[PDB]
Amino acid sequence: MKVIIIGGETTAYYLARSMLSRKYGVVIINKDRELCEEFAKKLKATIIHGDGSHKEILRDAEVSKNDVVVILTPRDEVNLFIAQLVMKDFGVKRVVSLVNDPGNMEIFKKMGITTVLNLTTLITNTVEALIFPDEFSSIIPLEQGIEFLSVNVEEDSPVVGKKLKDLPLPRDSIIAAIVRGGVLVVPRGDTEILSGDKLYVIVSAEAKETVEETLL
Amino acid sequence: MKVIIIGGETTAYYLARSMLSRKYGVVIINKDRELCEEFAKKLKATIIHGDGSHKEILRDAEVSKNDVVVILTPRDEVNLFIAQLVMKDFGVKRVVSLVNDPGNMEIFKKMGITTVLNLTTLITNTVEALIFPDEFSSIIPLEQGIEFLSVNVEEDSPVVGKKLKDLPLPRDSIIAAIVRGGVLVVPRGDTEILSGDKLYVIVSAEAKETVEETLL
Amino acid sequence: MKVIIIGGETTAYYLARSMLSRKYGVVIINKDRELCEEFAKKLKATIIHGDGSHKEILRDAEVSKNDVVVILTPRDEVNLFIAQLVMKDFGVKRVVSLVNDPGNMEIFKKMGITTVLNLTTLITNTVEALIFPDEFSSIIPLEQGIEFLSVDSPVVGKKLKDLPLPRDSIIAAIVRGGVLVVPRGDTEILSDKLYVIVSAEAKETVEETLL
Amino acid sequence: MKVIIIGGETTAYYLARSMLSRKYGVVIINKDRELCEEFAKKLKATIIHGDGSHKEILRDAEVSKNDVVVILTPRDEVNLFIAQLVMKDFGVKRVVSLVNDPGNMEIFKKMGITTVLNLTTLITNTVEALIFPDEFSSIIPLEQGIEFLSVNSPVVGKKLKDLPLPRDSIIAAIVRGGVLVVPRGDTEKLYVIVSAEAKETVEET
Amino acid sequence: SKYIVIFGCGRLGSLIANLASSSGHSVVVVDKNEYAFHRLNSEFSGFTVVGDAAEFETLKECGMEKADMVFAFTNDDSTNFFISMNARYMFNVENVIARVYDPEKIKIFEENGIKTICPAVLMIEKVKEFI
Amino acid sequence: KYIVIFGCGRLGSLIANLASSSGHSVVVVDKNEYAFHRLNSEFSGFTVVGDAAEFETLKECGMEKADMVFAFTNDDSTNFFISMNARYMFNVENVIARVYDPEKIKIFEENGIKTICPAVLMIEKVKE
Amino acid sequence: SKYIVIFGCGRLGSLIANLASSSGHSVVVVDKNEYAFHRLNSEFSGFTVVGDAAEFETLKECGMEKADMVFAFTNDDSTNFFISMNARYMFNVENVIARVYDPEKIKIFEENGIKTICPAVLMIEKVKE
Amino acid sequence: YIVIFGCGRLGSLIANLASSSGHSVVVVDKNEYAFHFSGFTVVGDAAEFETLKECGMEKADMVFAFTNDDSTNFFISMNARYMFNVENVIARVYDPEKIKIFEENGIKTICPAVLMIEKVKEFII
């Protein structure tokens, strides 16, 4: 088993550097001759210069059934192809892909490519958290239909001075972890939410509206 | 308040598309004349072609104290500069930056730039999860010193057939949510961790080793 | 002695191909990594990738006093430098350079770099010849102050001896239907491509007489 | 009649500058958007950004039957096409082209495109002249089958009449210390025009 | 009347679009840029979506949901592939036809049940006559 | 019959293989050697590596003894140039060119170069 | 003696490195590419780190921890800025000197307490004469 | 009669100190927006000969080759020295290794790197 990183300029570098440090075997497959030569010199991996979507190049990389192909290209239309090509024609079971358009996340899931959390989504969640810090901002989405949000306890908020047992949260919601001044607090019943504290929440989408209405 | 997206080819597009859809105002500042023209046509934002690190360009973009500057460049040395320039010379309080080298995440935090979760870290966590699915794999890291891991359960695991109350987990660890076959299970005391159930865990680093030793 | 071709994409290739065919030794010094690799594979020369204006690169190429450095860059300001650097710091006596701006030809001569006939000049002479075919069009300029031109007419039916040409003019060769005719006295022109060598201080009168 | 200069970075500029100075009309057709904008600003010509090989672009440039198309591209395969396209589909009689490979000069002549003297040839002639200055080095080749050489010894102290040169050779002009000398019989750097079928003997003599 | 969705209004693209519209079919022509629709003939009652076919928001805009036929006919194989996969697996279009340039790629389309028109495959027929 | 195929690419090599299997003497010219991987096992023909725009390459193919020259690179101008040399410099009786831009098709035939155009081929199928 | 770390062994870079080494200082020269170290002189006892100064793993390799002076002297302002910031805020180097090309950038360095050598600022002096 | 080539950051500073000192200045630059003073300004490429003629270096006491390009500045200087026989020609030279070939043609040079080594000497002590 080797980790086949299929192109992506700089992020492909740091992933390769990471994988190597994790004592894995890495094949970098990149179409940029210039960047290939820079990699070859820096990273201690196998650098195959060429188009990852070409069966021939993939054959040269020797992509095996058990290899993990990671597709990091900025073009989703290419990624999905490079994925299917690796999956159907080479029998690669484990495929990880970057998916640029948040809209395209679905088809990639449907096809059975496993995807890294969408960057632009994370960026949007982070940015919107900064603009509105006192509203339940979504972290990194868990399983399909369960989001992992987070809210900060405002001084003038209703939640302040309330017992976690006494708080009436919906059935499919869990106040997972409280974080008081950079310290994890395990939420027992007799736990009380204080000012300037940060409560992480896991809730199913079909109950998110009510969970926020109650907590905030 | 506008969202100033300072350059980054494709991811800068989808962010801009996202921001606009969230009824925000967007200023795209990109140095690629070609991509600027493509944006201008597609995205309904203000496209300023030029180097984000140049005070003059930022003046043209009219970056205000309350604006949210998002720096998405592949060069951390540039990002940190574009950040400081925006923060010190323009008084922008809210700065979000991509940080390519996981190693560089720290100095960005130390400087007070808020950062998006590192892509190559996520990718590494996702890839390592696929290679070793039956070991506690880290999700998205919470506050500095508290990681958010997850473990599947093996048919041949000790945790199977044990009460969540009976499980002896360390003080600074929380079994946040169980996910039985794509369904969220709120971990009560009398909850029994069944074989196949995916248990998400929040634990402080100073207790991660023991939490894994016990839960796995 | 080797021929050091200092960069110039395609023309640099064909020169290298030419030099090698003339059993010379060729060092190609080009800054384009991509083109360097293409050369390496095709041409059987020494390809040093790097900036020709950098003393270090020139040291790597081992440019010797006796080597012939050919500078083929599109930037005259660079050429003149690469030249002087090769001439003063490396002692290269023989330097051939492309000079893009016809205006710049002079300073290159003054500095003692020998120059290939200016392309845009030749192009202009060729184009102007096509637009006005029946007027004395200049070929390739000889020594500084002597041009080498070429040209119902009055000259038809006149003896070459009888033609009153100025002192510093020579009707060098007549070309009748793709055949060279050695101009004797009793040679007569007919309604004939006559090549002429004349000094600039006599060109006006030579043309006035030939038409 | 306008002079259509079809692409070629820097040499294309100086030709355009030259043509304009010769009170001609110039259409620069270049595929480099960046260079087109630089031209537009500097040169007082018509700059059409686009591929010269595309009929549409040539239509936009309005290449007329009487226009002189000059193709200055580094790719001969393109030049020959841009030429034929201008010649057959637009009826341009006057076409001047750069030809990079000296080997390709022939087919361009055969097709009836008039060509600028090959650069690499001139460069080779110039370089070889510097390496061997005391041997008959060829200048710029005249008509097909007649070369124009030059030489700078047994010939010293001999009358030009007394010199036994072959029939198809002419000692065109002597240049004594940067001064042209018209070669009379009683005449004692000599430029020579000789046919290829007589070059070997002309040099030997 | 079929509801045909033609992606890419190009040289080959719009030719499909015109033959479709003239045959009284309801056509939707999607293209990366508007100036491509110049190829759409005078008599054309169909609608045109400008947008990038690789973007999902574009694929939704075409209403492939109500489509009988999707033609992935851009100059990019991977794009055409992506278009088709969305048509087949995301909008469950019964008939999806893709223009595939690289003949080696033809297989992975049909392995996803996407009918393919390949110019190279079409040419080998005609080039056989020349012998 | 002595076939010379220029460009051993996707479409290129397919011609080369159909030719070689049909017992024809083939010469496959290509810009880079890694293209020749696309020629299959049973292939007795010879392969010239070289730039088809260079004249020295065209001489190396022995178009002099060719019955058919296929100009089949991805470049129209290159294919054009190849064909022109075949027709006017080596007087090859049959020269077939792969022409991408349909507007260019005319100037080939106006030089007596048979053309295979994918776009022209596609308009047929897109009709259906 | 002083433990000087010079980033970028370039035209201006290596000149610092040589004057430092000859003055009996312990030098460490970091550069993106090895061929730059040709510029460092014969008499040079210091160590050389090949690596990208923008990568953190490179900054750790230099031992800025034991440094008295860090010179951020690459041709890139942002790189030199980043180098400096790491020196100042990540390795707490007392003296950090940066080569800054764009004079408008000088301010944001000093606002982070990074002494700056700016060629344009140096030239305005001579161009005055 | 001072002729300053390149009206840039360092460039124009020379031009202003010159003009305020009551000297007749000519500022040549590749692009007009650089000119953002009684002297005259020539827009044009200093590598083109037609530009060098336009500056009237013939009547110049001082030519400053002060563009961001060494080779350009070199070329400017060589024309000043050998084509217009300007007595004083001063060149802005970035690469310190190039300084030599200027002075070997009798072109005085202002090198930032050479200027800096002075100031960087103070910082170590």
Ligand SMILES: Nc1ncnc2c1ncn2[C@@H]1O[C@H](COP(=O)(O)O)[C@@H](O)[C@H]1O
């Ligand atoms: N990513 C894309 N999304 C939508 N349309 C595209 C895309 N890429 C190319 N096209 C269109 O596909 C057509 C294909 O070219 P043609 O050979 O002329 O049919 C072009 O006119 C393009 O505008």
Ligand SMILES: Nc1ncnc2c1ncn2[C@@H]1O[C@H](COP(=O)(O)O)[C@@H](O)[C@H]1O
């Ligand atoms: N100048 C050239 N000489 C030889 N082969 C060429 C040249 N230019 C392009 N090619 C070939 O054209 C082929 C076309 O690729 P394809 O579109 O896949 O058939 C490639 O294999 C190239 O090697």
Ligand SMILES: Nc1ncnc2c1ncn2[C@@H]1O[C@H](COP(=O)(O)O)[C@@H](O)[C@H]1O
């Ligand atoms: N990111 C970097 N890390 C290390 N060295 C660099 C980096 N960027 C530029 N350099 C070096 O900076 C020097 C700049 O050249 P010079 O302008 O002549 O001083 C070169 O030797 C580059 O190798």
Ligand SMILES: Nc1ncnc2c1ncn2[C@@H]1O[C@H](COP(=O)(O)O)[C@@H](O)[C@H]1O
């Ligand atoms: N080749 C050139 N000819 C004339 N001016 C130039 C040339 N190259 C650069 N310049 C100008 O010289 C100045 C050099 O930068 P600086 O003086 O540091 O701002 C800039 O304003 C350039 O526009």
